[PDB]
């Protein structure tokens, strides 16, 4: 978990302008978080990038999890193999507010991070899930009590977050 170049926002939250896939290949953390959907179909955004970096091994594995256990609930999670990215992948389902899902579930999504001591994660519900990314960071800071290293791909978004926080 040799994280470098992070800015400490709170006692347990760190932030960096970086591609989470590149961070996972360098650090090889214990846990890499995926911003997933209830059926674990990793077709775009963070999910698409993480799956692509495993050459579809994450998708094949996920399809087998769904076949055996059924879909996740919004706000829920499951732990799968991290393959070549991490020891484990914590797939987390944030609400899709652009499809009417309740924003209050963003807290439930972040509560999953608390089961792991150290995590490399993206912001939840901030892609096509349509939630405000600055609001998503506020819920993260208020909810997660374990050590989370957030990797933010977009430099424009990164600078807006760092400015709003500090
Ligand atoms: O950090 C960000 O800018 C956004 C915020 C929530 C989803 C993040 C995202 C989206 C697409 C990505 C594509 N490739 C690699 C990492 C990617 C990360």
Curated annotation (Swiss-Prot):
Regulation: Inhibited in vitro by GRL-0617.
UniProt-reported outcome of changing residue 30 to A: In strain: Mu/B.1.621
UniProt topology in membrane: Multi-pass membrane protein
Organism superkingdom: Viruses
Catalytic activity: Thiol-dependent hydrolysis of ester, thioester, amide, peptide and isopeptide bonds formed by the C-terminal Gly of ubiquitin (a 76-residue protein attached to proteins as an intracellular targeting signal)
Subcellular location field: Host endoplasmic reticulum membrane
Ranges of residues in domain Macro: 1-166
Quaternary structure (record): May form homohexamers. Interacts with N protein.
Protein function: Responsible for the cleavages located at the N-terminus of the replicase polyprotein. Participates together with nsp4 in the assembly of virally-induced cytoplasmic double-membrane vesicles necessary for viral replication. Antagonizes innate immune induction of type I interferon by blocking the phosphorylation, dimerization and subsequent nuclear translocation of host IRF3. Also prevents host NF-kappa-B signaling. In addition, PL-PRO possesses a deubiquitinating/deISGylating activity and processes both 'Lys-48'- and 'Lys-63'-linked polyubiquitin chains from cellular substrates.
Name this protein carries in UniProt: Papain-like protease nsp3
Organism annotation: Severe acute respiratory syndrome coronavirus 2
Chain's gene name: rep
């Amino acid at each position: 978990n040799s994280f470098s170049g992070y800015l400490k926002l709170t006692d347990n939250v760190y932030i960096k302008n970086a591609d989470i896939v590149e961070e996972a290949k360098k650090v090889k953390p214990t846990v890499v978080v995926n911003a997933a959907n209830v059926y674990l179909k990793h077709g775009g955004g963070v999910a698409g990038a993480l799956n692509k970096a495993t050459n579809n091994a994450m998708q094949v594995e996920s399809d087998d999890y769904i076949a055996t256990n059924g879909p996740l609930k919004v706000g829920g999670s499951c732990v799968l193999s991290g393959h070549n990215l991490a020891k484990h992948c914590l797939h987390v389902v944030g609400p899709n507010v652009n499809k009417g899902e309740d924003i209050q579930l963003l807290k439930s999504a972040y509560e999953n991070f608390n089961q792991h001591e150290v995590l490399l994660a993206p912001l939840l519900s901030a892609g096509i899930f349509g939630a405000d990314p600055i609001h998503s960071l506020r819920v993260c800071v208020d909810t997660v009590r374990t050590n989370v290293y957030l990797a933010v791909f977009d430099k424009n978004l990164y600078d807006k977050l760092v400015s709003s926080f500090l």
